[PDB]
C-alpha cells in the first residue's frame, strides 16, 4: 500500500509548520523506537465488569489518538455488525492510532463477551466560534448505572466509569464538560443497544433518537433521554 503511504506523508508536508523536514528526519532515520504491540485484554470470569471496562479503556488509550491527519481504518457506518467486527479485529492486529469512531467499534468488539453490559452509541454535535464539531462515544449501562468508553482529544470527553444513576446525568456531564471549553451542545444522537453477536447481519442503529438540545429545553430534554433509556429495555 504505497499510494496510501505517500498520501500520509504528502499530507503531513502541508499541515505541519515544517512539513518536509519532519518526514525527512523520520523516514531517513535508521534507528527508531520499536513500539511494543499492545496486548488485547482478556478476562477471568471472576473479574467484575467495571474492572474489565477500565482495562478496555486502557487498551484503547494505549493505541493513542491519531494526530497524523490520516485515518488508517475507514468505517462505513452502514456496514453490518459482522463487518465492523472484522475491522475491529484488524485494528487489534495492526495496532495503530485511532480516533473517536474507531474506538466505538473497538469498544463493542471488546465488550461482546459481557452480556450483562449494555452498549449504545452517543454522538454529539457542538458549536464553537462559528464552527461545528462532531464527537461520538460508546455509552454503557451496567447494573442500572451509566458510563462511557471512547477516544477523545480531551480527557473529560471520553471515559466515564459506570456510576451515573440515569442517562440524563451521563449526558449532562458531557454537556458540562463541553461548556467548560465554551462549546454549545446543539444535538445528541443516541443509538439502540448493540447486539452481542459479533456475526450479526444487522447495522448499528446510530439514530434511534435525535434530540435538538436548544429546541427542547431543560426538563423536556431530560424526559427525552429517559424515554430513550426506557426504550433500550425493549
Amino acid at each position: 500500500d504505497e499510494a496510501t503511504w505517500e498520501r500520509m506523508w504528502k499530507h503531513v508536508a502541508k499541515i505541519h509548520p515544517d512539513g518536509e523536514k519532519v518526514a525527512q528526519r523520520i523516514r531517513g532515520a535508521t534507528d527508531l523506537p520499536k513500539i511494543p504491540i499492545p496486548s488485547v485484554p482478556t478476562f477471568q470470569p471472576s473479574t467484575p465488569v467495571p474492572e474489565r471496562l477500565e482495562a478496555v479503556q486502557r487498551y484503547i488509550r494505549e493505541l493513542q489518538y491519531n494526530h497524523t491527519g490520516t485515518q488508517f481504518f475507514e468505517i462505513k457506518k452502514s456496514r453490518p455488525l459482522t463487518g465492523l467486527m472484522d475491522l475491529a479485529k484488524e485494528m487489534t492486529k495492526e495496532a495503530l492510532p485511532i480516533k473517536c469512531l474507531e474506538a466505538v467499534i473497538l469498544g463493542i468488539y471488546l465488550t461482546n463477551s459481557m452480556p450483562t453490559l449494555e452498549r449504545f452509541p452517543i454522538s454529539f454535535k457542538t458549536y464553537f466560534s462559528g464552527n461545528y464539531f462532531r464527537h461520538i462515544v460508546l455509552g454503557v449501562n451496567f447494573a442500572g448505572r451509566y458510563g462511557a468508553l471512547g477516544m477523545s482529544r480531551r480527557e473529560d470527553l471520553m471515559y466515564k466509569p459506570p456510576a451515573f444513576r440515569t442517562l440524563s446525568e451521563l449526558v449532562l456531564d458531557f454537556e458540562a464538560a463541553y461548556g467548560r471549553c465554551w462549546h454549545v451542545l446543539k444535538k445528541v444522537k443516541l443509538g439502540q443497544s448493540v447486539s452481542h453477536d459479533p456475526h450479526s447481519v444487522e447495522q448499528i442503529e446510530w439514530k434511534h433518537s435525535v434530540l435538538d438540545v436548544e429546541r427542547l429545553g431543560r426538563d423536556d430534554f431530560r424526559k427525552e433521554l429517559e424515554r430513550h433509556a426506557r426504550d433500550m429495555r425493549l
Binding site: L101, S152, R153, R154
Partner: peptide, 5 residues
Amino acid sequence: EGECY
C-alpha cells in the same frame, strides 16, 4: 465524526 471534541 472526525473532530473528536
